[PDB]
Symmetry: C3
Subunit: 151 residues, 3 copies
């Protein structure tokens, strides 16, 4: 029973992996640690969420956005390791959101990422996390997600 089967059972198709925005690699590996560059909420090559939590998007939409960015991040991890069953653990999630001052519910939005990790990787998806808000995002994305995996 693989992460891939769970994606199928959840009705989730892994997107095509997006190109870097600059002269960097989409992931790197040091020893047993695999880490992604920033992953966006793309669907069918379109950046679906462009704006700010609390102003343009509700918390439930932010949740959806972090879920989709994480699906993109998982696509990136699959590209890197072939079979997602090779991943011993997704030990760390780090996420950035653009958030209006009137809203401090961004940890709920980032649960979109956390929840998918647990859904797809099970106990292997239990992770620590970091959260940031930034005023300006690449592509005006609502969010950016980074994953760290142990092989």
């Amino acid at each position: 029973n693989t992460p891939e089967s769970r994606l199928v059972a959840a009705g989730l198709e892994l997107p095509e992996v997006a190109a870097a925005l600059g002269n960097y690699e989409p992931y790197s590996i040091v020893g047993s640690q695999l880490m992604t560059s920033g992953q966006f909420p793309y669907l069918q090559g379109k950046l679906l969420y462009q704006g700010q939590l609390g102003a343009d998007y509700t918390v439930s939409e932010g949740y959806a956005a972090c879920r989709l960015a994480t699906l993109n991040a998982i696509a990136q991890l699959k590209q890197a390791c072939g079979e997602l069953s090779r991943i011993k653990q997704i030990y760390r999630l780090e996420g950035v959101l653009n958030v209006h001052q009137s809203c401090i519910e961004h940890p709920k939005a980032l649960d979109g990422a956390s929840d998918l990790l647990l859904e797809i990787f099970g106990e292997a998806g239990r992770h620590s996390r970091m959260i940031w808000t930034n005023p300006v995002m690449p592509l005006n994305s609502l969010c950016l997600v980074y994953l760290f995996a142990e092989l």
Copy 2:
């Protein structure tokens, strides 16, 4: 008798707080190999978030220093829960801190020294760390700061 981090906390008159619950569906710490890393730690005292606002607007630099010190005390409580005896930590090799800072203030590195100085006070040479610092406009719980620690076991 023994020069443990715990004895230094006692000597400093510092009691470790109870470890706060996660704000979402994540672990308070994770371990990969010999690397133990916390999730975000807040300046809680007796279950109350003591600093809520922005450096330079709501809090002075010395208050930010105190806030980062308290968040780091919380982070040390988290580490103690994870490893039992803080003597088991070979080094706190990295501190990463976030503050909410008003444009009129660039003395946030001095605030984050509240964290760095406590790591050195409590862990001695094992507390020597590199560090990252960020400012963010919006914080969870409107906290003035958030601290993350990374330790080698």
Copy 3:
């Protein structure tokens, strides 16, 4: 041999003197085979050359120049730690912070100043993943801060 040092020479780049910490922390630390710097600034001859905000005070090409200079500072730090830059197996990660005005989202182009220098100087050993942030307030009002992670 073609080495990072020889490539710096070829690019006409001199490594700056390594700046002091802004607080009670180490300029780098090491866990296992992983070396990680603290924040590195765009210093030239001991002067912080870029103080302000991308899109407001500095253009994208100036941001690129700033990130390049901060990265040259970071490489100076790496050379101090490792002695010979050939001993670095890889610069596996770059993490950069910029202060950026709402009117500008071309900060990834500015951070390419850092990414491009790593590739120019370290070649294949300079291929890295990266993280980018924007923060409203920076230490020393620097335009940018760069952090490097190297495998030893």
